[PDB]
Protein backbone atom coordinates (compact mmCIF):
# COMPACT_ATOMS: atom_id res chain seq x y z
CA UNK A 1 0.00 0.00 0.00
CA UNK A 2 1.22 3.52 -0.85
CA UNK A 3 0.15 4.80 2.59
CA UNK A 4 2.95 2.79 4.26
CA UNK A 5 5.99 4.86 3.24
CA UNK A 6 4.34 8.11 4.31
CA UNK A 7 3.31 6.61 7.65
CA UNK A 8 6.86 5.36 8.22
CA UNK A 9 8.24 8.80 7.38
CA UNK A 10 5.79 10.39 9.82
CA UNK A 11 6.86 7.92 12.52
CA UNK A 12 10.54 8.68 11.89
CA UNK A 13 9.94 12.44 11.92
CA UNK A 14 8.00 12.28 15.19
CA UNK A 15 10.66 9.99 16.65
CA UNK A 16 13.57 12.34 15.85
CA UNK A 17 11.84 15.51 17.11
CA UNK A 18 10.60 14.27 20.49
CA UNK A 19 11.36 16.46 23.50
CA UNK A 20 13.63 13.80 25.02
CA UNK A 21 16.21 14.53 22.31
CA UNK A 22 18.82 17.29 22.63
CA UNK A 23 18.43 20.48 20.54
CA UNK A 24 18.44 19.20 16.97
CA UNK A 25 21.75 20.04 15.23
CA UNK A 26 22.40 22.57 18.04
CA UNK A 27 21.40 25.93 16.63
CA UNK A 28 22.44 25.70 12.98
CA UNK A 29 19.54 27.45 11.27
CA UNK A 30 17.74 26.17 8.16
CA UNK A 31 16.17 28.17 5.33
CA UNK A 32 12.38 27.88 5.33
CA UNK A 33 10.34 26.76 2.31
CA UNK A 34 6.97 27.58 0.79
CA UNK A 35 4.21 25.25 1.99
CA UNK A 36 2.89 24.42 -1.49
CA UNK A 37 1.45 20.88 -1.26
CA UNK A 38 4.42 18.91 -2.50
CA UNK A 39 7.37 20.62 -0.81
CA UNK A 40 9.24 17.26 -0.94
CA UNK A 41 11.89 18.70 -3.26
CA UNK A 42 11.80 21.98 -1.32
CA UNK A 43 12.37 20.28 2.04
CA UNK A 44 15.08 18.09 0.51
CA UNK A 45 17.00 20.99 -1.04
CA UNK A 46 16.59 23.09 2.11
CA UNK A 47 17.79 20.37 4.50
CA UNK A 48 20.60 19.30 2.14
CA UNK A 49 22.71 22.03 3.80
CA UNK A 50 22.86 20.61 7.34
CA UNK A 51 26.39 19.33 7.99
CA UNK A 52 26.03 16.09 9.92
CA UNK A 53 24.39 16.19 13.39
CA UNK A 54 23.83 12.45 12.88
CA UNK A 55 20.14 12.75 13.81
CA UNK A 56 18.41 13.69 10.54
CA UNK A 57 20.02 11.12 8.26
CA UNK A 58 17.01 8.81 7.86
CA UNK A 59 14.77 11.84 7.36
CA UNK A 60 16.86 13.00 4.39
CA UNK A 61 16.99 9.42 3.11
CA UNK A 62 13.20 9.08 3.07
CA UNK A 63 12.82 12.59 1.62
CA UNK A 64 15.13 11.69 -1.27
CA UNK A 65 13.08 8.51 -1.60
CA UNK A 66 9.92 10.57 -2.09
CA UNK A 67 11.75 12.98 -4.45
CA UNK A 68 14.07 10.84 -6.60
CA UNK A 69 14.93 13.51 -9.18
CA UNK A 70 16.24 15.88 -6.45
CA UNK A 71 15.27 18.87 -8.57
CA UNK A 72 17.34 21.97 -7.83
CA UNK A 73 16.09 24.56 -5.36
CA UNK A 74 15.77 27.10 -8.18
CA UNK A 75 12.10 26.18 -8.54
CA UNK A 76 11.09 28.63 -5.79
CA UNK A 77 9.22 31.68 -7.08
CA UNK A 78 10.92 33.78 -4.37
CA UNK A 79 14.34 33.09 -2.85
CA UNK A 80 13.24 35.06 0.22
CA UNK A 81 12.40 31.70 1.81
CA UNK A 82 16.07 30.86 1.27
CA UNK A 83 16.88 34.18 2.98
CA UNK A 84 14.76 33.93 6.14
CA UNK A 85 16.45 31.76 8.77
CA UNK A 86 14.78 29.54 11.37
CA UNK A 87 16.17 26.79 13.58
CA UNK A 88 15.88 23.12 12.62
CA UNK A 89 13.18 22.55 15.26
CA UNK A 90 10.64 25.01 13.85
CA UNK A 91 11.13 23.94 10.23
CA UNK A 92 10.91 20.23 11.05
CA UNK A 93 7.81 20.80 13.21
CA UNK A 94 6.07 22.69 10.40
CA UNK A 95 7.07 19.99 7.91
CA UNK A 96 5.73 17.28 10.23
CA UNK A 97 2.44 19.13 10.70
CA UNK A 98 1.93 19.74 6.98
CA UNK A 99 2.83 16.11 6.23
CA UNK A 100 0.31 14.89 8.81
CA UNK A 101 -2.30 17.10 7.14
CA UNK A 102 -1.41 15.75 3.69
CA UNK A 103 -1.58 12.18 5.01
CA UNK A 104 -5.01 12.77 6.54
CA UNK A 105 -6.10 14.31 3.22
CA UNK A 106 -5.42 10.98 1.48
CA UNK A 107 -2.68 12.54 -0.65
CA UNK A 108 0.32 10.20 -0.34
CA UNK A 109 2.64 11.09 -3.23
Amino acid sequence: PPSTALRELIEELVNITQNQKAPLCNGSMVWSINLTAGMYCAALESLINVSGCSAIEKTQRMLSGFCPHKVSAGQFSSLHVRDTKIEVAQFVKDLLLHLKKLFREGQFN
Epitope: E11, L13, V14, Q18, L97, K100, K101, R104, E105, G106
Partner: antibody
Protein backbone atom coordinates in the same frame (compact mmCIF):
# COMPACT_ATOMS: atom_id res chain seq x y z
CA UNK B 1 -26.15 27.31 10.31
CA UNK B 2 -27.32 24.83 12.95
CA UNK B 3 -27.81 21.08 13.39
CA UNK B 4 -31.12 20.15 15.03
CA UNK B 5 -32.44 16.80 16.27
CA UNK B 6 -35.79 15.45 17.45
CA UNK B 7 -37.10 15.61 21.02
CA UNK B 8 -36.49 13.22 23.87
CA UNK B 9 -37.29 9.51 23.60
CA UNK B 10 -38.22 6.71 26.00
CA UNK B 11 -38.06 3.02 25.10
CA UNK B 12 -38.30 -0.38 26.75
CA UNK B 13 -35.75 -3.23 26.59
CA UNK B 14 -35.81 -5.23 23.38
CA UNK B 15 -37.52 -2.39 21.49
CA UNK B 16 -36.09 -0.18 18.74
CA UNK B 17 -35.61 3.55 18.17
CA UNK B 18 -34.97 5.76 15.13
CA UNK B 19 -33.56 9.19 15.96
CA UNK B 20 -33.37 12.15 13.58
CA UNK B 21 -30.87 14.94 12.98
CA UNK B 22 -31.63 17.73 10.49
CA UNK B 23 -28.97 19.87 8.81
CA UNK B 24 -29.77 23.49 7.90
CA UNK B 25 -27.29 26.21 6.96
CA UNK B 26 -24.84 24.65 4.51
CA UNK B 27 -24.57 22.19 1.60
CA UNK B 28 -25.40 18.82 3.14
CA UNK B 29 -24.34 17.01 -0.04
CA UNK B 30 -20.71 18.07 0.56
CA UNK B 31 -20.52 16.67 4.10
CA UNK B 32 -21.33 13.56 6.11
CA UNK B 33 -23.01 13.21 9.47
CA UNK B 34 -21.39 11.35 12.35
CA UNK B 35 -22.87 10.12 15.62
CA UNK B 36 -21.25 10.13 19.06
CA UNK B 37 -22.93 8.69 22.14
CA UNK B 38 -22.33 9.63 25.77
CA UNK B 39 -23.39 7.50 28.72
CA UNK B 40 -24.42 9.63 31.72
CA UNK B 41 -21.27 10.47 33.65
CA UNK B 42 -19.01 8.59 31.23
CA UNK B 43 -16.75 9.45 28.32
CA UNK B 44 -17.73 9.76 24.68
CA UNK B 45 -17.73 6.84 22.24
CA UNK B 46 -17.76 6.99 18.44
CA UNK B 47 -20.80 5.18 17.06
CA UNK B 48 -21.17 5.67 13.30
CA UNK B 49 -20.55 7.81 10.23
CA UNK B 50 -22.54 8.19 7.01
CA UNK B 51 -22.04 10.29 3.89
CA UNK B 52 -24.58 12.36 1.98
CA UNK B 53 -22.97 11.81 -1.44
CA UNK B 54 -22.55 8.05 -1.93
CA UNK B 55 -24.24 6.28 0.98
CA UNK B 56 -21.33 4.50 2.69
CA UNK B 57 -21.44 3.72 6.40
CA UNK B 58 -18.95 2.76 9.10
CA UNK B 59 -19.46 1.46 12.63
CA UNK B 60 -17.40 0.49 15.65
CA UNK B 61 -16.88 -3.07 16.88
CA UNK B 62 -19.27 -2.34 19.75
CA UNK B 63 -21.98 -1.29 17.27
CA UNK B 64 -20.98 -3.23 14.13
CA UNK B 65 -24.25 -4.94 13.24
CA UNK B 66 -26.56 -3.69 15.99
CA UNK B 67 -27.28 -0.37 14.19
CA UNK B 68 -28.50 0.82 10.80
CA UNK B 69 -27.89 4.29 9.35
CA UNK B 70 -29.64 6.18 6.56
CA UNK B 71 -30.15 9.76 5.43
CA UNK B 72 -32.84 11.57 3.43
CA UNK B 73 -31.55 14.09 0.90
CA UNK B 74 -35.03 15.61 0.55
CA UNK B 75 -35.06 17.16 4.04
CA UNK B 76 -31.31 16.82 4.79
CA UNK B 77 -32.04 14.63 7.82
CA UNK B 78 -30.22 11.40 8.69
CA UNK B 79 -31.86 8.51 10.54
CA UNK B 80 -29.72 6.42 12.87
CA UNK B 81 -31.79 3.38 13.85
CA UNK B 82 -30.75 1.25 16.83
CA UNK B 83 -32.23 -2.21 17.37
CA UNK B 84 -32.05 -4.77 20.19
CA UNK B 85 -31.46 -2.06 22.78
CA UNK B 86 -29.94 -2.97 26.14
CA UNK B 87 -30.10 -1.45 29.61
CA UNK B 88 -26.70 0.24 29.23
CA UNK B 89 -27.40 1.77 25.80
CA UNK B 90 -29.10 4.69 27.57
CA UNK B 91 -27.12 7.68 26.30
CA UNK B 92 -27.51 10.98 24.45
CA UNK B 93 -26.89 10.40 20.74
CA UNK B 94 -25.40 13.58 19.27
CA UNK B 95 -24.74 14.25 15.59
CA UNK B 96 -21.93 16.25 14.03
CA UNK B 97 -20.76 17.38 10.61
CA UNK B 98 -17.84 15.39 9.21
CA UNK B 99 -16.07 15.12 5.88
CA UNK B 100 -17.52 12.66 3.38
CA UNK B 101 -14.06 11.15 2.79
CA UNK B 102 -14.42 7.37 3.09
CA UNK B 103 -10.71 7.18 4.00
CA UNK B 104 -10.31 9.67 6.87
CA UNK B 105 -12.47 11.16 9.62
CA UNK B 106 -11.78 14.85 10.27
CA UNK B 107 -12.63 17.00 13.28
CA UNK B 108 -16.17 17.85 14.36
CA UNK B 109 -17.32 21.47 14.47
CA UNK B 110 -21.12 21.60 14.19
CA UNK B 111 -22.68 19.96 17.27
CA UNK B 112 -26.44 19.61 17.61
CA UNK B 113 -28.07 19.74 21.03
CA UNK B 114 -28.58 15.98 20.94
CA UNK B 115 -31.31 13.58 22.02
CA UNK B 116 -31.59 11.58 25.24
CA UNK B 117 -32.78 8.00 24.79
CA UNK B 118 -33.48 6.30 28.12
CA UNK B 119 -34.03 2.53 28.29
CA UNK B 120 -35.86 1.15 31.33
CA UNK B 121 -38.18 -1.77 32.02
CA UNK C 1 -6.31 2.31 19.67
CA UNK C 2 -5.56 3.33 23.27
CA UNK C 3 -5.28 6.76 24.87
CA UNK C 4 -4.93 7.31 28.63
CA UNK C 5 -5.24 10.93 29.69
CA UNK C 6 -5.45 11.92 33.38
CA UNK C 7 -9.09 11.80 34.50
CA UNK C 8 -8.64 14.83 36.75
CA UNK C 9 -6.71 18.10 36.63
CA UNK C 10 -6.75 20.52 39.58
CA UNK C 11 -5.53 24.07 38.92
CA UNK C 12 -5.82 27.48 40.61
CA UNK C 13 -7.65 30.42 39.00
CA UNK C 14 -5.66 32.85 36.89
CA UNK C 15 -2.79 30.43 36.24
CA UNK C 16 -2.12 28.25 33.20
CA UNK C 17 -3.74 24.81 33.25
CA UNK C 18 -2.08 21.81 31.60
CA UNK C 19 -4.16 19.00 30.11
CA UNK C 20 -2.20 16.27 28.34
CA UNK C 21 -3.34 13.15 26.49
CA UNK C 22 -0.39 10.93 27.30
CA UNK C 23 -0.59 7.78 25.22
CA UNK C 24 1.04 6.07 22.21
CA UNK C 25 2.40 7.67 18.99
CA UNK C 26 -0.52 10.17 18.97
CA UNK C 27 2.03 12.89 18.20
CA UNK C 28 2.37 11.38 14.73
CA UNK C 29 -1.41 11.88 14.32
CA UNK C 30 -3.51 15.05 14.23
CA UNK C 31 -4.69 15.39 17.85
CA UNK C 32 -7.94 17.36 18.05
CA UNK C 33 -9.71 18.58 21.20
CA UNK C 34 -13.27 18.93 22.48
CA UNK C 35 -14.73 20.86 25.43
CA UNK C 36 -18.09 19.91 26.94
CA UNK C 37 -19.85 21.89 29.66
CA UNK C 38 -22.19 20.18 32.16
CA UNK C 39 -25.58 19.92 30.48
CA UNK C 40 -24.53 21.21 27.05
CA UNK C 41 -23.33 19.85 23.73
CA UNK C 42 -19.54 19.47 23.39
CA UNK C 43 -17.87 22.20 21.35
CA UNK C 44 -14.73 22.20 19.22
CA UNK C 45 -11.79 24.13 20.67
CA UNK C 46 -8.52 22.93 19.14
CA UNK C 47 -8.12 20.95 15.92
CA UNK C 48 -4.85 20.09 14.16
CA UNK C 49 -3.25 21.15 17.48
CA UNK C 50 -2.69 24.71 16.27
CA UNK C 51 -5.82 25.88 14.44
CA UNK C 52 -8.59 27.57 16.39
CA UNK C 53 -11.83 28.19 14.45
CA UNK C 54 -13.75 31.45 14.63
CA UNK C 55 -15.35 32.49 17.90
CA UNK C 56 -12.82 30.48 19.92
CA UNK C 57 -10.95 32.58 22.53
CA UNK C 58 -7.28 33.46 22.04
CA UNK C 59 -5.91 32.03 25.31
CA UNK C 60 -6.34 28.50 23.88
CA UNK C 61 -3.48 26.58 22.27
CA UNK C 62 -2.46 22.95 21.88
CA UNK C 63 0.96 21.30 22.05
CA UNK C 64 2.26 18.10 20.49
CA UNK C 65 5.73 16.71 21.19
CA UNK C 66 6.28 13.12 20.08
CA UNK C 67 4.98 10.68 22.69
CA UNK C 68 2.95 13.39 24.46
CA UNK C 69 0.47 16.08 23.41
CA UNK C 70 -0.82 18.72 25.79
CA UNK C 71 -3.49 21.42 25.87
CA UNK C 72 -2.44 24.90 27.04
CA UNK C 73 -5.17 27.01 28.65
CA UNK C 74 -3.94 30.15 30.42
CA UNK C 75 -5.78 32.52 32.76
CA UNK C 76 -8.03 29.88 34.28
CA UNK C 77 -11.58 31.25 34.49
CA UNK C 78 -14.45 29.60 36.36
CA UNK C 79 -16.67 30.23 33.33
CA UNK C 80 -14.71 27.58 31.39
CA UNK C 81 -14.74 24.87 34.07
CA UNK C 82 -15.76 21.84 32.00
CA UNK C 83 -14.49 18.52 30.63
CA UNK C 84 -11.98 18.16 27.80
CA UNK C 85 -11.79 15.06 25.60
CA UNK C 86 -8.63 14.37 23.62
CA UNK C 87 -9.68 12.97 20.25
CA UNK C 88 -7.48 11.43 17.56
CA UNK C 89 -7.72 9.56 14.26
CA UNK C 90 -6.61 5.99 13.55
CA UNK C 91 -6.69 3.20 10.96
CA UNK C 92 -6.98 0.19 13.29
CA UNK C 93 -10.15 -0.94 15.05
CA UNK C 94 -12.24 2.23 14.71
CA UNK C 95 -11.28 5.40 12.79
CA UNK C 96 -12.13 7.58 15.80
CA UNK C 97 -11.14 6.83 19.40
CA UNK C 98 -12.09 9.44 21.99
CA UNK C 99 -10.37 9.89 25.34
CA UNK C 100 -11.16 8.92 28.90
CA UNK C 101 -12.28 12.38 29.94
CA UNK C 102 -10.58 15.08 32.02
CA UNK C 103 -12.62 17.25 34.40
CA UNK C 104 -11.00 20.66 34.92
CA UNK C 105 -11.04 21.03 38.71
CA UNK C 106 -10.95 24.81 38.95
CA UNK C 107 -10.47 26.06 42.52
CA UNK C 108 -13.68 28.07 42.45
Amino acid sequence: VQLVQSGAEVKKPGASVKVSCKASGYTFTNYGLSWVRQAPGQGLEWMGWISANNGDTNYGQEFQGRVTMTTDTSTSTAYMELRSLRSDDTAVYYCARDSSSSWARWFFDLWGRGTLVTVSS
Amino acid sequence: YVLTQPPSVSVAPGKTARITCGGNIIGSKLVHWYQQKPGQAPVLVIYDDGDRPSGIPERFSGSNSGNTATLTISRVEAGDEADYYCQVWDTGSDPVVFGGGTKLTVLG
